[model samples]
Target: ALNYRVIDVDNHYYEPLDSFTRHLDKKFKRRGVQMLSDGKRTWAVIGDRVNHFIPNPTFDPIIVPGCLDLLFRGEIPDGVDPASLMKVERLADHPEYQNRDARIAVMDEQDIETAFMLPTFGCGVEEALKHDIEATMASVHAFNLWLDEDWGFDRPDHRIIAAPIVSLADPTRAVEEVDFVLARGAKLVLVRPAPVPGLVKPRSLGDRSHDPVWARLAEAGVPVGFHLSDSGYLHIAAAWGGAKDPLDQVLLDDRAIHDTMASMIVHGVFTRHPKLKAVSIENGSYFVHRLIKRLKKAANTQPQYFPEDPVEQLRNNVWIAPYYEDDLPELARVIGVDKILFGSDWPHGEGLASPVSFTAELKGFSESDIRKIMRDNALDLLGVQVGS
Candidate 1:
């Protein structure tokens, strides 16, 4: 086996309370993001609980993800407090989780050559402002700017690329943010795998109106990342039983990822622009099996309805980072070797205790295939090289 470098496609860095409000416009200071107390822990955003769904808001020593590592490897146990079990208390235990210099050194030790870093607190903004159009889009701009302020758009020659979060409520503003990030050297931007709830007329991201956004992204060689988050979904289950802990919400069996991909294809987004690329992070790979099977049968049952075989578009235009607990081998077989990527929700309790530990799950796969999953697949997706 070649001693290849690893690239963690799903790494996350916790944003401090100020991340959302630092670059915020003066008008949003009251309604956007603010600290409720003099403590580093909690802050309140418009319509959000200052508790922030957890008691410890300062984000110090965040949850002990490594402590609850096994729970994430398999199905989370029923009736267990997933959040409480995993939250850490101080940054010292895992300094590298939020620090860049430390992260580079740590990555070398972990044998990870590069990692596409994602946001933590910034992800909460979309759901908090889902009902407000201006705020939602503005919040994304604020968040992205903060990311650039703290880390960068794609610093250190792309070894650590920061994925700026973007909102799609206003297609025009969305495109503007896309250009903003691209001009700043961002290679990718993260968006939720859900429809825009704040738009005046509800339309899927694949709607023609959003063509400008996709066109710009594809032209810039920027791939949009559809990540799993609050997404303001799961409210439907509330009618049956009052809302569960928002933090405890699970998308493993949810339709967010699958439906987003469907919207893009069925709505002719990919048909119109095949150069566009989408990467699914943290969402398990087993769904790819179900999605591909359904697409094949549906296309066969009604071939005229599709522009092209949906399966081919999925294989051609997208990549996925399967969870370590999932059926890795079957995932590779269904999606093919090239589309498969390795994403360890590194330093998170529900992710791999050690990034390299994920390989243990791919028991039967050959070494060459493993290299593709661990390193090469991610490099191909990013269009970057090692030690550049």
Candidate 2:
């Protein structure tokens, strides 16, 4: 029996075929993305360049919800296709994933009192199409509109918070997008967790150049979220590999998650925007202990580099949602229970079958701590009560 209500911060929503390209600009429409005649969907290209990196973009034959049961059970698999293995369920079987009211109606059954919903299909496009800023940003605009149309911008009923992606690669444009979402009622905006791409160099998310965007988000009173997705940083893995499939590839690279946090903290993004809130979702808690330790040493060795102690930046500004199998006791100890968040990437294969079942991993904790991890922390971070 569940003891308290839950809020899942890491929830995801898969987009229909028209999610990005349908309302996009005509000049950039072909450059955005489309559902092809074949079973797959792909980004259209222009000039001499061809399509972006992702070959299988469609979700029709997606891996079943919670199909990674054995892996979640702690059994290391010798071989597993990330997408195709044990595939089950399609759009027809899971309308709740794409519909808003259907999702709210079913929340009671999962005991998830409230959730911050994230989009699925367009997570990686900005990075993949980084070379084409025009097309890259147009898709971003279309995505926010699609999210608002399908799910209420700032939902009157408090069961769900629909988060839209805000790209920091362009500051003025980002401010425009931020205002659009805030005008509609978004309390949190999702931005890719990576070094922002530039014409000649990559910049950290907290770079001084982006003060405009950061200030807007801070002024708007909305926290920024860094969810896991395919990013330009992953090209390192491609260099070492040969012919392969997406399934056999690393789904969530731990190092990338580590680097993202390190960049934000080490570069002093949080120092400048103390009111800024951030969440590290889907990236489990194992590396955090090591990361904190590294930051402590780095601060001592390089005092001139950071405006503040990197360790405090992480502990104070950002929250984390560890995978269900993470060492809960250690995570809570490293960062107090208040800093930990409960995120069920619901309807996604690697997620918990039910959000409340995450308590099974918190066996040794007192009921107080468990409640904090499961519900209280999310409410504090999201700043909302269920049904408010």
Candidate 3:
């Protein structure tokens, strides 16, 4: 046993049917997420379209966690079909998926001290409602309220911390939402890792208009997570004659994530709000090497374009929770061990059976480095004293 605190930075909860509809405004009755039935099946109807990102949004008969481990680790039989290995069980059979107390009990058994719980369906909500600003803010606020009501932003026991989703579609309302969550003791917030869907066209994350949102969060010392989301980059793939299947979409995630990170680093968002912390979760560490390389080249060739060293801003202001299947040692060597977070994507098909089981991948790392990746690093992100 490592004898150090264990914290999983990427855990998730399957949202219930009423998660968005419960607190949705009356005017957005049809514009927001509506749970409708088609014969014997239930679906999450977002705006005017069905959210196919998650084929089964009901989450009743959910995909078992770690079922796709072999596939993700590239160990599955070459000739075998991936879907053949899938297994599903009723959510009711596992009460912990929805109830915080139940989750805490499960965490005790897993030997994990704390976990940062993020949204599952909530990731795709903003993209679905992107065109309608009113619907976007309304749906986001409603989801935050539901998140607070069910899985609180910051639980009293300091376990099972849920991150409220924030969008910069409207800067004024974005600041308002930050204030709302911060006043309620929110320790972390989730921001989509893509361009802000503006009224006319998409806007860069480092755009000056959105600085107020970052400023408020910086003042509160709350870290922002840019989790893997439906970042509206599917069109890029489509334009190249690629299919737009959900699986195909995942392949192009690195592009969206890289561009978003570059926008922040080049535009000096970190220089402006030095206190703000931006953490990337569930997007994997595959983009790290490329991002650093590109930033280094830009800084070397165009020193006069930036106010400060772009690479330094990235290394200092950003934190990353890499997938277990990624090259952890290489990541630590490039990005340093202090900012590397241990994440399992638990309760999701692509995650792990046991969160701590991720330690097996850190075989060659020293105990001190392992402790930082598994425990102390996340505690620092949460603003918890490491020795405490």
Candidate 4:
């Protein structure tokens, strides 16, 4: 069998509320949301006021085609039943099965070497525990601790790279957290998509407040990933009178990619933090092409507001990870292949079935372009050594 070295830029792991509270102080424990359990398996609870267990309402139960089944058992063939998959025993006893190792083993089976792990539940910790920045930060910190311990800090081959979560509650604190984790060998950092509470829109890397964070990140040469989070819901849907329908929410969420990207590029974040690299993950890439073009047109007419040509800035510091179904050639034409990184949202129900097959979609591209998108780009961006 022919094998190729693949690197997954995006993957997710669900951390239940109990995981956070278990390590928290007694005061925070009472304020923390609890995960619902069936005496054995535990499920995460999400939402405000009236909390509902995940996979209970918000997420659809459909099994992603070509990927490992998130749910562990059932009549479904080759599928993972949710019951078995959620047990702390399954995770602890079989770290290779429950956590990044499972994905690593699958990657090895599929001929991949390294996978960059993103947080599934913790990604939206702030929005989930809205109005409670302290708890949100605590929850995210606890999850990172668990991840580090479970996956071991330094793997010989660098199979599992931890991407720590940074809250926007206090930019200064976020920088400290970044330095703390990087000291412990963390290679990348993940920040929520939308603006922090007090800010109107998301801040660009160039924002004066974020300058320190960018300076440190550039010093370390580690990329700060801006993955999609639930933060965009209120900011994007406010235009639609705060529609609450699930489908409507998805539409508004999908629309956020365009709005968020436009906001960041026009804000001149990239122009200022030229060495700071960013990857917009999970959000589809097709819109990025149109976004660049539209921004170009707007810049031509309204040079003052949209000054500092976005296309130049994009090529200099920004990278994007679009969905598998996105038009790669068109995106490459618009954003340049060097700016497109391969991100298979593994383990999530909506993620790709087989992370390896994801690169096959880009087979038509030239060898150099393929090399960049498949592995080189992410490795360079994240400042990690790529495996052979």
Candidate 5:
């Protein structure tokens, strides 16, 4: 065992059926995420749409962690069906998946000193409600209220750091939510990487209208994360007759992170809110080099658009919680070790079985750099003393 404790930046919590409904306003009851069953299966219906983002919304029998590790690595043997690899067990059998105390107990067993918990279903709901701006704001706010009650923004022991969702559909309300969570000791908040759905038309996260929200988050000194979500980019693939396999859909969704990060740089969000901290989780790092290269070229071709170097803006304000399968050395060379955060996406079929096992991918890097990726970097993001 290693001597130092690890901080997993990409842990997830399986949402209980009431995660969205518990605090939802009664007037929007039919409009928000509601669960319905036909005896055999349950579905999460958001607005007029039935969400397919999560095949099993009840999450009673959830997939085993790392079951799809080989599939995600693109190493599945010939003639193997991806569905055959998925193994499931009852959620009641794994209390740690939903309970904080149980999670800390397992964290101790896993040698994890701290973990930043994110949502499973909560991440994708905004897209389902994208058309109704009022409903989007109300639903996400209701989820945050439930988050504060169940998982909490920050626990006293600081072992379970759950990030509440903040929808920028309404910038004024976004600022209000930021203030609401910050006052409750939220160290981090999750922002969807998709475009902000508006009453008139969608807008960028860097749009001038959203500067108020960015300024509030920046002044409050809290980091905002853009975790992998149903960011509406899948429609792009659909428009072109997308692949039948679900994994192929994820490739298009991956573009959300790049586009969001690029939006921040190109629109000069950082220039106005330079103190804001932008974090990307479970979104992978393959796009970092590509984004930087493109931004450099864009700056060269259109110098008038960039007041300062766009590459520097991305490298300065954004921190990446990379997928374990990413090229760690290449990521380090592109963005430096300090900006890399270790995220296992634990308890997900696509993530690592054991979070710390990510260290195995750090070959060729020194122990110091390995520690930076696995632990110290996250500590810097949280601005906290480990186990203090």
Candidate 6:
């Protein structure tokens, strides 16, 4: 029913607690963390107490909504009939009923032609718990299996691409995992903002240790997706003075995307890896504009830090997924149309509730620019030919 196609680059999935624990060895399984919920709310629990401290003691019964719950639980306040959330004009026939359909159905409802789905639980899991290389890898592998089974990769019409987490704890293993997933048709990869365990800083794409992985990704034409997650490993939340409460930590950590991207750019990773395409997902576009300007100024003063102008590199290599609330026109003024891309963070409660009506949010852009942000840019990034 929708008139135009939407390419949502940031949809997420929540893996049920049993999905990982059931598959793990007994020892790990017993010791493994589990998410506890009182039917309406959920929280991650490891060895008893809540993993992250919630500030409001009275708000103890925080009802964390699951992904499917958010999609279908119309009873909850702020919840919409998924079918009616997007503009009917752009919706596919009875799209809401096909909730389990590989992301394609949701896209079809939103009139989206293609989409790149990211792992919700796995990405967050890597950041939520301590660095357990084997556990992390096992969790990710289990997720990929579930993903493949739930959303068959063989179905071209309802494509469900996998973005496996590459552990920084062991770069060699990371490269091996990349090679393994690429063989299985992975086009996008996900990583957290912090350095892998044992490493002091995030490994740059240009780092010699990562050269093999980057080469593999570039050769396969897969872009690296750096999504925003708690940067507890980086001590960012504690340093920001919100250590005591989870909600405060979440609020303070929201800026991690901006800071992480800035670190990547100023560290000369973009300049060093000319072919690599990096996307900052989930962060709003407003910060991107400011980041580009500040980096450009820094480039002028510190040419040594940037052998090539940072802005030029951003224009050519970097792409960002702006939040629906972000002012696209202002983002365009700071970072040109070519650099902006659409990412609804679909299925996540904090992201756009109506994926189909996302275009309605782009009222400020011209028709052509809107087209690019909504669909074309993602197609180009994913190397998929757009259908006329």
User: For each predicted model, how many residue pairs clash, with residues at least 3 apart or on different chains?
Assistant: 14, 1, 0, 12, 0, 11
Query: Can you write out model 3's per-residue Cα lDDT over 1-388, one digit (the tens) per residue?
Result: 6686599999999998888889999899899899889989888888878887778787979889999988888889878988798999988998999999899999988888889999998999898988988899988899999999998988788887899988899889999999999998899998888888888888889999999999988887789889889888888867766733666656586787788899888877998998788899988888888998898898888888776888778787788998777888888888888999999899999899888898999997998889999998988876834363
Where is the poorest 10-residue window by lDDT in model 5? 379-388
Instruction: Give per-residue CA lDDT, model 2, range 1-388, as digits (tens).
Output: 7766788887877787788766788787667665555343454343234444444455666667677855665574677554444666666677788888788877878888888888776776776667766676778898888888988666788888888888876777888888888898988898887778766677887688888888887666688888877666556656656255553346435766788888877877778778777888887777798898899889888888866878878888788988777777778777878998888788888786777777778887888888888888887886733453
Tell me the alpha-carbon RMSD of every candidate. 3.6, 3.6, 2.2, 6.1, 2.4, 7.1
lDDT score for candidate 5 against the true structure: 0.88
**lDDT by residue for model 4 (1-388), tens:** 2235877788665553444555655556545555656775555554334443244321223334333333321334465443443322223433443455565766777666777777655654566665666666666666667667665433566987768777656677767777777787877777777666433443543357876776777677777777777764655456765523655555565565666666567776666666777778887776766777888898898898754778777766778887776788888877788788887776565666666667667877987778788888887777633461
- The C-alpha TM-scores of every prediction are 0.89, 0.89, 0.95, 0.79, 0.96, 0.76
Q: Top lDDT: which candidate number?
A: 5
Best of the two (4, 6) by TM-score: 4
Cα lDDT tens digits, model 1, 1-388, are 2387788898888777678788888777766767786554345646444525334445675776566776655456778775656555667776777678778888888888888899776666677777677877777899889889777878855678899987888888898999899989998888788887655656787878889988888777678898877665666556436445644355325577888888887777888888888899977776776788888888888878786989989988899988766777677667788888888887766677688877887777888888888888887886733452
Candidate 5 lDDT over 1-388, as tens digits, reads 6689999999999999999999899988989999988899999999967899898898979899999988999889999988799999989999999988898899999999989999999988999999888888889889988888888899798887899988999888888888888898899999999898999999988899999888888887788899999898877767767737665566584788999998888998998888888899999998898898899999999999988988888887889988777887888888888999989999999999988888888886898988888899888877733462
Q: lDDT value for candidate 6?
A: 0.62
lDDT of each: 0.77, 0.76, 0.87, 0.65, 0.88, 0.62
With a 3 Å backbone cut-off (N, CA, C), the pairs that clash in candidate 3 are: none
Clashes of 5: 0
- Specify the poorest-scoring 10-residue window by lDDT in model 2: 39-48
Q: How well does candidate 6 match the true structure in TM-score terms?
A: 0.76
